[PDB]
Amino acid sequence: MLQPKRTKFRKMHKGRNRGLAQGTDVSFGSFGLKAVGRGRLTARQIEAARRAMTRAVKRQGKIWIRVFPDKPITEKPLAVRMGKGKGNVEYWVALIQPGKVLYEMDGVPEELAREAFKLAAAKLPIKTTFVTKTVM
Amino acid sequence: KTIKITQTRSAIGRLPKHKATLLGLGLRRIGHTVEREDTPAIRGMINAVSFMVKVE
Amino acid sequence: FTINAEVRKEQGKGASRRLRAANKFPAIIYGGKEAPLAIELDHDKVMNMQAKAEFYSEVLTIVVDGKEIKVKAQDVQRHPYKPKLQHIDFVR
Amino acid sequence: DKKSARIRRATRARRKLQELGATRLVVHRTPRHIYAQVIAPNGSEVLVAASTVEKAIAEQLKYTGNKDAAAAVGKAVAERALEKGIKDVSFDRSGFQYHGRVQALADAAREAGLQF
Amino acid sequence: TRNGRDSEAKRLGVKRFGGESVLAGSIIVRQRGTKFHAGANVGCGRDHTLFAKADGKVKFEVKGPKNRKFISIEA
RNA sequence: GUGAAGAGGGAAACAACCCAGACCGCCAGCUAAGGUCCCAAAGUCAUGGUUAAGUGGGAAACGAUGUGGGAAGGCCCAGAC
RNA sequence: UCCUCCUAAAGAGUAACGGAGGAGCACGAAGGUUGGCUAAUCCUGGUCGGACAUCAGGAGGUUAGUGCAAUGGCAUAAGCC
RNA sequence: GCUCAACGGAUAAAAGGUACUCCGGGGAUAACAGGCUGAUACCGCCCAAGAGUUCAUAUCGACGGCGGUGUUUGGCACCU
RNA sequence: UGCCUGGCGGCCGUAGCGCGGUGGUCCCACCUGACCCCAUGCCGAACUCAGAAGUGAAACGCCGUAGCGCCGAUGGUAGUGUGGGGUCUCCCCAUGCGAGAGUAGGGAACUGCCAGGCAA
Ligand SMILES: [Mg+2]
Ligand SMILES: [Mg+2]
Ligand SMILES: [Mg+2]
Ligand SMILES: [Mg+2]
Ligand SMILES: [Mg+2]
Ligand SMILES: [Mg+2]
Ligand SMILES: [Mg+2]
Ligand SMILES: [Mg+2]
Ligand SMILES: [Mg+2]
Ligand SMILES: [Mg+2]
Ligand SMILES: [Mg+2]
Ligand SMILES: [Mg+2]
Ligand SMILES: [Mg+2]
Ligand SMILES: [Mg+2]
Ligand SMILES: [Mg+2]
Ligand SMILES: [Mg+2]
Ligand SMILES: [Mg+2]
Ligand SMILES: [Mg+2]
Ligand SMILES: [Mg+2]
Ligand SMILES: [Mg+2]
Ligand SMILES: [Mg+2]
Ligand SMILES: [Mg+2]
Ligand SMILES: [Mg+2]
Ligand SMILES: [Mg+2]
Ligand SMILES: [Mg+2]
Ligand SMILES: [Mg+2]
Ligand SMILES: [Mg+2]
Ligand SMILES: [Mg+2]
Ligand SMILES: [Mg+2]
Ligand SMILES: [Mg+2]
Ligand SMILES: [Mg+2]
Ligand SMILES: [Mg+2]
Ligand SMILES: [Mg+2]
Ligand SMILES: [Mg+2]
Ligand SMILES: [Mg+2]
Ligand SMILES: [Mg+2]
Numbered sequence: 001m002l003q004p005k006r007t008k009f010r011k012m013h014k015g016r017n018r019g020l021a022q023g024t025d026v027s028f029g030s031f032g033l034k035a036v037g038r039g040r041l042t043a044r045q046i047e048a049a050r051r052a053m054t055r056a057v058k059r060q061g062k063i064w065i066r067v068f069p070d071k072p073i074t075e076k077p078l079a080v081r082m083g084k085g086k087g088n089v090e091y092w093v094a095l096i097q098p099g100k101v102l103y104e105m106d107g108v109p110e111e112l113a114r115e116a117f118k119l120a121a122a123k124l125p126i127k128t129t130f131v132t133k134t135v136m
Numbered sequence: 137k138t139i140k141i142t143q144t145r146s147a148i149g150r151l152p153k154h155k156a157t158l159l160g161l162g163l164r165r166i167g168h169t170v171e172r173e174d175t176p177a178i179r180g181m182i183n184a185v186s187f188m189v190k191v192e
Numbered sequence: 193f194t195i196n197a198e199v200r201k202e203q204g205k206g207a208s209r210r211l212r213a214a215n216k217f218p219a220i221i222y223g224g225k226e227a228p229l230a231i232e233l234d235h236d237k238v239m240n241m242q243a244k245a246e247f248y249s250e251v252l253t254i255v256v257d258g259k260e261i262k263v264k265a266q267d268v269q270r271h272p273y274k275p276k277l278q279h280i281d282f283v284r
Numbered sequence: 285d286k287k288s289a290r291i292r293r294a295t296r297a298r299r300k301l302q303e304l305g306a307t308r309l310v311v312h313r314t315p316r317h318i319y320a321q322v323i324a325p326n327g328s329e330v331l332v333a334a335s336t337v338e339k340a341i342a343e344q345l346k347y348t349g350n351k352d353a354a355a356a357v358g359k360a361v362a363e364r365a366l367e368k369g370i371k372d373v374s375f376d377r378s379g380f381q382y383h384g385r386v387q388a389l390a391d392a393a394r395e396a397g398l399q400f
Numbered sequence: 401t402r403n404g405r406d407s408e409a410k411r412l413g414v415k416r417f418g419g420e421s422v423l424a425g426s427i428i429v430r431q432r433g434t435k436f437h438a439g440a441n442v443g444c445g446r447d448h449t450l451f452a453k454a455d456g457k458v459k460f461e462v463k464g465p466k467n468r469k470f471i472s473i474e475a
Numbered sequence: 476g477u478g479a480a481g482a483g484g485g486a487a488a489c490a491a492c493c494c495a496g497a498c499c500g501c502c503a504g505c506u507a508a509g510g511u512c513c514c515a516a517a518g519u520c521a522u523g524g525u526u527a528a529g530u531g532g533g534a535a536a537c538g539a540u541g542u543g544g545g546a547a548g549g550c551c552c553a554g555a556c
Numbered sequence: 557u558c559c560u561c562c563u564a565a566a567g568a569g570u571a572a573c574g575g576a577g578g579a580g581c582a583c584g585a586a587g588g589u590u591g592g593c594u595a596a597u598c599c600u601g602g603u604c605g606g607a608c609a610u611c612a613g614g615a616g617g618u619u620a621g622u623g624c625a626a627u628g629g630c631a632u633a634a635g636c637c
Numbered sequence: 638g639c640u641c642a643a644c645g646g647a648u649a650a651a652a653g654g655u656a657c658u659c660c661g662g663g664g665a666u667a668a669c670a671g672g673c674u675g676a677u678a679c680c681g682c683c684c685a686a687g688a689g690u691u692c693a694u695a696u697c698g699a700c701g702g703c704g705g706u707g708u709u710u711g712g713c714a715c716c717u
Numbered sequence: 718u719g720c721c722u723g724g725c726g727g728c729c730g731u732a733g734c735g736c737g738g739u740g741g742u743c744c745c746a747c748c749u750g751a752c753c754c755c756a757u758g759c760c761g762a763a764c765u766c767a768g769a770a771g772u773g774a775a776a777c778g779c780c781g782u783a784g785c786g787c788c789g790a791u792g793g794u795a796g797u798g799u800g801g802g803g804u805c806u807c808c809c810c811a812u813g814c815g816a817g818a819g820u821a822g823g824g825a826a827c828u829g830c831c832a833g834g835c836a837a
């Protein structure tokens with residue numbers, strides 16, 4: 001389960017997931033899973049999607065994960081009032097804008113590629129699409 | 137050379153700036169044919185409230 | 193690898209989007225001692241032309257107002273998620 | 285590297301002095317020879333200049349780079365400066381420690397007539 | 401909760417901007433560290449405060465080898 | 476910005492949404508938002524398409540020879556599906 | 557109560573039992589001024605001496621230092637004798 | 638000469654109980670019920686690693702996801 | 718008149734680094750020694766003084782080099798002021814303004830005041 005190995009600060013502001021992503025081109029591998037919709041992936045969902053990917057393509061086929069959470073989400077305990085400090089950190093999330101390449105993959109056919117990403121895409125909350133690396 | 141300005145909308149839920157700009161143009165109420173000489177300023181004042189005015 | 197392309201007159205965000213939402217898109221030609229020239233062109237053709245690898249290597253003879261300009265595709269701006277082109281940078 | 289160490293040593297006095305808008309007497313001591321020149325408050329044009337490099341000065345003197353020469357330069361600055369129409373200036377030692385040749389120049393300058 | 405403390409705000413920054421006429425003694429910039437530097441007819445107080453040393457207009461400039469914002473006055 | 480302290484028209488009804496600021500009168504006309512088959516003032520108005528679900532007239536992941544549009548590449552007269 | 561940063565929407569100001577930290581002093585040298593010096597951290601060599609004491613050079617260049625938090629500052633040094 | 642630090646300092650000097658209570662007020666502010674919300678709860682679905690002699694989809698269904706209801710524990714404090 | 722140096726600037730990286738050479742007629746730089754003036758918290762290394770045998774080795778200055786740093790359009794993109802609209806945790810349209818990043822290219826500088834010496 002992915003998490004930042006130490007940080008400056010414990011608790012972070014909510015912010016606003018807005019605009020468009022930068023990691024748009026498939027950089028390392030041949031294929032990849034691009035996020036069409038807007039949202040935010042948890043540390044659990046990324047792991048859960050990676051497990052389902054890795055298992056679909058066996059020992060073979062190298063995988064890369066482009067996203068990383070690094071934004072702590074707080075939660076108030078049940079049966080507690082408003083105020084009195086900020087809530088404790090429960091899980092970590094990456095904010096995902098349209099055109100963020102989530103996962104990449106290399107060393108497989110396009111036939112067996114799509115079937116791996118279809119399993120992963122079901123684990124994720126975001127609406128996604130398959131993408132291919134192009135020469136410029 | 138003169139330019140006939142007219143007001144074509146209310147000045148109620150507008151910004152202080154836009155309530156002022158009409159006061160500068162001399163547009164008191166809707167349906168008011170005013171005539172001002174053409175300058176770089178006045179066209180800026182029209183342009184600033186382009187939505188609520190008309191040129192003739 | 194011939195493409196018939198038009199010269200632009202309107203340009204800016206307002207123009208570029210009105211263009212880009214009409215099965216066309218903006219591009220530009222530059223390089224050498226000559227002046228840089230802005231281009232309007234069809235989407236559907238250039239979308240199919242870039243299927244082959246030769247598009248990102250070989251010389252392209254772009255037809256403008258009769259004259260054939262010899263260029264190479266230097267850079268391209270992809271649309272964030274949809275499979276489509278926003279802009280092309282042709283070099284002479 | 286001496287030069288760069290001598291410049292940053294001399295910068296404080298320069299920046300301090302040019303801010304007031306003072307007509308400054310700059311000096312540059314060399315191991316052999318010595319230079320002196322009065323610069324305008326703007327810091328651009330030289331009003332008066334003098335050194336042992338001039339043959340009129342060098343033919344009279346025995347050696348070009350000592351106290352009794354630097355005094356003769358310091359006198360020659362003062363004798364010109366009064367003819368040009370200058371009197372009140374400010375001494376800028378320019379990194380060189382005020383003690384020997386520069387002091388012999390300054391003393392000879394203020395003994396002759398120049399006012400600082 | 402080990403938080404909820406903050407100091408009184410200071411009212412720092414620029415008070416007189418480019419071209420504005422100032423009187424001898426008027427504060428131009430009131431800052432902490434010398435972000436702006438004293439030029440012609442400007443002094444620096446013990447609080448690192450840039451104030452007019454003569455009547456005239458404010459001139460903001462950028463000069464020096466290390467490239468710093470100097471404030472100056474010309475009558 | 477509005478209400479509070481601003482009535483009037485519209486959003487079925489609806490302080491704060493949209494339109495617009497009520498000095499008083501008139502069985503005058505032109506307009507705003509919103510509308511125009513009947514309740515209820517005004518287009519069963521004209522031109523070319525879409526939908527067949529009462530969608531319109533609550534909603535998601537996801538599902539599917541539902542249906543309407545352009546653009547390329549696969550195969551034929553050695554006769555393909 | 558006071559101080560620093562963020563919240564605070566590029567002048568100032570700006571709330572919450574919002575997010576992180578500090579102060580209730582210290583100093584006749586740690587003030588004044590005049591003259592001169594420039595750091596961290598590595599590398600190689602060298603007695604006891606080791607990863608690290610002191611010495612020498614070279615690379616790096618201000619990643620140091622600033623009586624005490626953080627911010628903004630400082631080579632003309634506000635740093636160090 | 639004041640941790641007058643409850644730091645614009647009420648006095649030089651000050652802790653508790655009330656179910657024995659009382660008066661003045663408040664839905665400016667809680668308990669009951671209603672409302673708004675739905676984290677939680679309960680009810681569904683999506684994906685399918687496995688269980689199921691073999692065989693994911695008879696019955697199950699991890700890792701995760703998307704909804705519905707207003708039946709729980711709550712939040713808010715808009716009505717009294 | 719030019720060719721060179723020196724100080725003093727101005728301009729603050731198209732101006733700075735790493736390479737490639739080159740200057741000693743003067744000029745500056747090491748250099749030369751240390752009754753002395755002054756100097757070291759040990760030391761003439763530093764500052765200082767007295768100098769004129771050497772080399773331009775270090776440093777510097779100049780010439781050439783893109784191997785770097787730096788500068789940098791046009792076009793697009795994000796953002797956004799004003800007025801609308803939607804499928805309203807975000808977008809779209811008109812109308813201004815319009816980046817950063819990136820690309821083609823440019824690019825190892827450029828000029829004022831005096832002072833010397835060589836060909837005139
Ligand atoms: Mg309005
Ligand atoms: Mg423009
Ligand atoms: Mg505050
Ligand atoms: Mg303060
Ligand atoms: Mg009231
Ligand atoms: Mg009506
Ligand atoms: Mg009605
Ligand atoms: Mg209501
Ligand atoms: Mg609204
Ligand atoms: Mg409207
Ligand atoms: Mg109706
Ligand atoms: Mg009725
Ligand atoms: Mg009717
Ligand atoms: Mg502010
Ligand atoms: Mg502001
Ligand atoms: Mg506060
Ligand atoms: Mg000093
Ligand atoms: Mg001090
Ligand atoms: Mg108080
Ligand atoms: Mg107070
Ligand atoms: Mg009892
Ligand atoms: Mg009683
Ligand atoms: Mg009672
Ligand atoms: Mg209440
Ligand atoms: Mg009430
Ligand atoms: Mg209250
Ligand atoms: Mg209260
Ligand atoms: Mg209740
Ligand atoms: Mg209920
Ligand atoms: Mg309840
Ligand atoms: Mg309450
Ligand atoms: Mg309230
Ligand atoms: Mg009730
Ligand atoms: Mg050499
Ligand atoms: Mg641009
Ligand atoms: Mg740019």
